[PDB]
Design the sequence.
């Protein structure tokens, strides 16, 4: 039978695959969908528990029936205990003995904790928390007085006055004490291998934080709390700190100063305040930047030293994500890279590796030392189909995309889907939305135009400062090639759709051609000037992507020329607008302007407005609103195609 | 000096369940904690029992669960293969849970609105039987509707009002992960035990509601999915122990014709016939020794150690020990310390687990002779050792004890009378007595004629004549205490007791003025009204006295045995302690004593507890246990 | 299709008829029956409730003043002396309503509410009692209650507070509240002096004397020192005093009660007080003050305070041979009738020198409010089925002739005969309106009800005839009367009889069924079965038997006599199927009385059924929550239908 959006409710979502210190076990998180019963309103919700495997079919460790559930499993160095975080009780640090018995609660903070990390010697558990700080401004209806340049963040909503402090659990003493209360905030954190302290990333002040300039600090264990020592004058973006086994050097993931957001994230070896590129000769970014919609929870990608010379890391290459090794004394060698697959998360040590793997046709699964330990693809409720590759030509070389077809041979509408970013990739991630589209009779066309991230730095740079030129050209070129190479696609029943940057591009295309019969613009951008003033990254995004400062009079003129709203008078395509109220990455005023403009021109238009959700709705929103979004997608395509 | 809140330092063990392999004990431990540890009322403390499961495999016991809200976890039951623990959680009204012992947390199996109770695995591991009222709603009280009563008994102490439909027996199908109703009785189910081949269960039931009120029950056979009658017992049956042959079984109780006063004994059933099994043993089955550190369930079910040997516990002269009865023979000691009390035990062919205590040692859990807990270490002040004091009767020598404070000064003498009356003082642990001595009082407590541990004749001596030789023995003993213990101050004496001890405190103060103060607890004052109001009123006086309150001639004799008839003689300032939901001794008993003392202008004080029942001093909510002890000492300080 | 108990839901119940100071208006209370929450009714459970409002008339059809839609409603209207304002109590806050236009204003905001508002004659003050903002979280927290006082519960009020309600003062001109007097025991009757200088109050010396029904009268001036001086004693009464009526001269006053030596069995009379000395005022009137006639259509307050019509004349009500009439007592003479119908009952009245307002009823006519002889309500028109007229039947006694009545259904067929026994025992059946009796006849039963020796309306000797020997001549009169009913009324079926009664009527139903098996069914209501335990549990147990029987349950010799007078001693003789009706919060006859009877009948395997009402008290049949009044009547008829 034909599937619908609620096929999602059959799925269980894996995350956070943590290999044991001896390399022979994996503990991971599994989110299943269960009731929050209200007789008048169904309430399907994510509920997570911990699972364990030593090579065979994984078994459950916890059984949450209320709340969000359990997450962030962390092995004690001796391999006998699992720390984790429970919300059933707001996010408390818990301690589970693996040889029998239930967990013990360790923290009772009003605001909960996050990001637990054992020290390598097993004597401490580090975590961050706002402890019992009270803020009844919203509860009382008081005003919020804002003086900092950034005050909201997507997913976190309003940033607190005092940032979360780093805390310490003394395992032997069974005692908690505050370690370091920063004034700005803590980014990446990693223990030194000798457990003497941690390395942390933080910014000098609130302005420098808004400009994506951070430094690395050394924080020894407290005696009074500890004072961070400056360790590297980086003045740029840094995360995923990876201390070397020698206890003195460390690797950094990021980009050096002067290079904006558009440069590939790379690996850098730090020695006495000096930095050198570590993944040299590898023209691809560190980490997973391939699209997919079956990722709920944390997906660790921190690089790990397999010995004194070898650093294991993941990298995005042409729509795929593989594991690679970087070497102090040499170049980059493949470790576990399938050009048709995506490794979305991994942990490792000198004894073993655990990861999550997926493809365009295979639902995410957990692996332990090459052995699959889950059977989650078996729960996928309808048959998956294999995409077919379609290429196009550009002055920079051959680009590629794919078409996913339904069963049968009759004519089907062709849906041009545009991925966001713009510096991400379509390809070999698993996309429930795409498989659902094909199962309901649509041909899905999706590609990696110039500006995508997996085809070298030059492919990224091609769109710098001129969004809506060669990137829109590649997309319509690709789509023309799909109609030519796939005769069952119906060129008279076409639609264009995309999210975020894909929404910007959906708005741009419909304002420059009437060829499409329907359009769906999701968490879109329509006015680049207003975006600079309202978005949580507005103070720096256009500066790095376009070289434009919205508050500078000369630049604003070009920003308007790059704004889809300038050309809205040409739009004739019936458009569905999907947006969330708490999306601080692309604020909803972007969608409201497009909606009002189409109304002024009497263009058929429909606007579905989600409360409480943020930018991440389509990948990890509450189950019922993920269903509603897909329902609105298909209702619009059924009406116009 | 320490005070009543010393109770808050204690942790209370219960339900010692040995594993099928004989090498492990899982038990329940109640600790005292705030009702809501996160949001405490700054103006009102709310200490509460909160229980979790603990485990030991030979060494120091460790906790398996960590309840921080609700009443907690209880009723641990081992799966036959030893790999899982079933238990009941209130954190969620009493749900059946399933815990793997080799790693991982428990899973919830039942979701009934009214919760479950009494889980028992079948021997083959395929089923877990339990009772529940499932999702039955009774909104009469919530709506303020009337209750229409037609049955002879409608209240019970601890359970408050009995439901129209009794709890049904249910079945958890382990292999199928399915629940099914097994049998919905019309009257109610008493004791239950699986046949050793897991073909079904034996159950105790009464023919109708009237027979139940007269303590007459029968045994039925219930196959796995109508009960078939198996034994015409027509009497009290309290525990069932199926024989390993799968056909015979032993029961704890007494045969027809013998009233409540006869010792509970063991009887082997074969083809509707019964034969006495604990022959030559002039002592009752089970623990009947006083103590106040027992919170929770205390299993005492007899267990077959082989085809010829049945292990059981028994009360002997203030102690409780383990014994074996042997087919074709008599009774042998198995684990009997005449100065200690085994209050609970489980056993199989591989091991034994139990809880042990003495007059000087707080309850501890034991496994195969090894103590696995350290709970006496939590007792917050030094305990003291009592000295024995005897008295002479025409039936032989009686005994009692005196617990003295430290030092050499003179101290007031407190005569404490145990209830029942067919129980024993002696070698249980009594926090109240230790606290009394720690605050400067000499505690005198004895086992007069009518006590249960000194043979059937010692019990029968008071039949039909409460207030004769029992009152004589008590004052004889107290006189012997003042003579043998010179630090006791004969000018500063008090008398106190609960239930039957309250009856006797009311009786004694009405026949002598020798005491400076009196404290009467959950008392009896009017034997006629008791017959109509108590949850055992339809049978208690008939068995204990041979008198029927609804018969004119008998009622007169009941009035002559009523302390209220002699209240005109009471001159002793009296504190009255009683709980409103005590259905064993209804509060109308205390209200009559209070009004009569007021009429004679005798100094009197009446502390009236809500919500609590007859069991307050042994297991009430912590704050009301504190309040009761506070009132005891405030009254003694005022008059002594 | 015979009418049933829910016919009660059609009725509206009047109370508290307050005449205005100029005598030309009446404000009164009307309780109507409505859903607990008319906006959200439970589809599975009806919730009919009393809801009261104030009504006003100057001679014509009364008009509503308030419109309560939630809660119990508005009550206790009190006129300002200038006639322009109504004070009242809203649920319980003191409110002030201007009569010429506009809504009421709330004047008290105490957590615990108000009671007993009384204007001062000069209009400057409103006196009332309240526990103010005292908090008592024992029950809420589950704490113990420590009792040291001889009386700690009271029927209707449940548990008495540690600190008695204090008398408070609203300063009308200043819009200010101040505490007036915080008593150590409690305040009984209260009345203003005519010059508004203060109040007279009734209180006991200590808790023990209060338990023995011994009170005195005190003088309480308006408060000055912020710490009240001890009130000076005004009369050494040492006895019961119920209603104070200050004389217009501002120095003498009359009290309702009885002097020392005379126990509870003595008729309440009027006494004129002058400088600590007392003399009887209602001389030559061998009948008690106040309404003591049975009826079941009285919901709310029924004032009966005597009022001086001039310097010589004191108006009061009195019970005479099943009726209640108005009389005047005279300082210089004897007692004269004022408005006395020997076939009617005046249950409440107020008066001054210019007019009178009252509530009147009869055996066939539902209570109505009248003003200066003009009826202003039409409540009898709402009675949902035809009313019937009783027939009188007499019986012979050594003291003279007694009387009773029979109410027959329509038609000519034979009908069961129901012997109904009124409680007290010192009350009267007769000419009150009884919805229960009319419903019985409407469903085919003959109702027989009489005034045996011990009743209150036939002289003091008729009362004294039963002293110390309940169950002798009183039981004799009842069965004598019933035998004469069967002889004089041939439609009564002597083979289908039942006996029933409440309180003392329950004692007597238990007594009769234990001394004869002649009845086919019995219904015993809020009964007494054990006179010994009653002495220890009842809220009047410390004094009732002493006054009624001369017996002290806490004395060994007396207790034996009490047991011989206890119906439970003879329960082995009971064979009659018995329905037992009782409420849990009845502190007048505690439920342990019913539990003993129930258990005894079970022990003898006699058919028995026990209806146990929560929350209700002794007054269920007269003023309980509507749904439980229906349930009681339903159980009555279901039991009669099964056995008759």
Sequence:
């Amino acid at each position: 039978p034909a599937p619908g959006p609620d096929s999602l409710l059959a799925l269980a979502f894996p995350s956070d695959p943590q290999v044991s210190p001896d390399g022979k076990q994996v503990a991971f998180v599994l989110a299943q969908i269960s009731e929050e019963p209200d007789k008048d309103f169904a309430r399907p919700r994510y509920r997570s528990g911990l699972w364990l495997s030593e090579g065979g079919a994984a078994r459950p460790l916890t059984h949450a029936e209320t709340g969000r559930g359990d997450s962030a499993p962390r092995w004690s160095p001796d391999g006998q205990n699992l720390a984790f975080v429970r919300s059933a009780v707001k996010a408390a640090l818990m301690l589970l003995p693996l040889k029998g018995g239930e967990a013990r609660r360790v923290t009772h903070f009003k605001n909960g904790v996050s990001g637990p990390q054992w020290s390598p010697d097993g004597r401490f558990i580090a975590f961050t928390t706002t402890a019992d700080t009270e803020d009844k401004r919203d509860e009382r209806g008081e005003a919020r007085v804002l003086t900092r340049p950034v005050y909201r963040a997507n997913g976190a909503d309003w940033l607190p006055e005092r940032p979360a402090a780093l805390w310490l659990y003394d395992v032997e003493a069974d005692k908690l004490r505050e370690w370091y209360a920063p004034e700005i905030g803590i980014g990446a954190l990693s223990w030194w291998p000798d457990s003497r302290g941690v390395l942390i990333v933080q910014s000098e002040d609130e302005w420098q934080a808004s400009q994506w300039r951070q430094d690395v600090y050394d924080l020894p264990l407290p005696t009074a709390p500890a004072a961070p020592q400056k360790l590297l004058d980086w003045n740029s973006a840094a995360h995923g700190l990876a201390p070397h086994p020698d206890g003195q050097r460390f690797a950094l993931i990021g980009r050096p100063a002067g290079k904006g957001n558009t440069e590939h994230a790379h690996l850098y070896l730090i020695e006495n305040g000096q930095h050198r590129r570590l993944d040299t000769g590898h023209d691809h970014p560190v980490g997973d930047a391939v699209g997919g919609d079956c990722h709920v929870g944390a997906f660790p990608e921190g690089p790990r030293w397999l010995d004194g010379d070898t650093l294991l890391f993941s990298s995005t290459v042409r729509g795929s994500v593989g594991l690679f090794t970087a070497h102090i004394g040499g170049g980059v060698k493949a470790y576990d890279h399938d050009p048709q697959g995506v490794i979305s998360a991994f942990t490792a040590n000198e004894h073993g590796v655990a990861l999550i793997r997926e493809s365009a046709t295979r639902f995410p699964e957990v692996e332990l030392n090459g052995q699959r330990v889950t059977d989650l693809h078996a729960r996928f409720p309808f048959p998956v189909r294999e995409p077919q590759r379609v290429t196009f030509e550009t002055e920079l070389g051959e680009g590629e995309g794919w078409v996913l077809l339904p069963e049968g041979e009759q004519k089907v509408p062709a849906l041009l889907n545009i991925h966001g970013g713009p510096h991400t990739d379509y390809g070999h991630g698993f996309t429930h939305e795409f498989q659902l589209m094909a199962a309901r009779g649509y041909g899905v066309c999706y590609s990696n135009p110039r500006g995508s991230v997996g085809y070298g730095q030059a492919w990224v740079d091609a769109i710098y400062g001129r969004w809506g030129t060669v990137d829109a050209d590649d997309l319509l070129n690709f789509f023309d090639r799909c109609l030519e190479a796939v005769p069952r696609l119906d060129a008279a029943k076409t639609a264009v759709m995309g999210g975020a940057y894909g929404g910007f591009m959906t708005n741009w295309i419909t304002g420059h051609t009437t060829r499409f019969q329907a359009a769906i613009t999701d968490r879109c951008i329509s006015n680049l000037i207003s975006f600079g003033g309202t978005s949580d990254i507005g103070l720096r995004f256009w500066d790095d992507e376009l070289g434009l400062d919205f508050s500078r009079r000369a630049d604003a003129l070009k920003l308007w020329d790059l704004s889809p709203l300038q050309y809205v008078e040409n739009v004739k395509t019936p458009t569905l607008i999907v947006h969330s109220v708490l999306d601080h990455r692309c604020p909803v005023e972007q969608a409201e302007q497009w909606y009002a403009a189409l109304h002024k021109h009497q263009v058929p238009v429909r606007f579905v407005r989600f409360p409480e959700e943020n930018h991440e709705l389509s990948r990890s929103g509450r189950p019922d609103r993920r269903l509603t979004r897909l329902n609105e997608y298909f209702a619009w395509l059924e009406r116009w195609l």
In short: Chain A touches chain B through 17 residues (CB under 8 Å). Chain A has twelve helices and 38 strands.
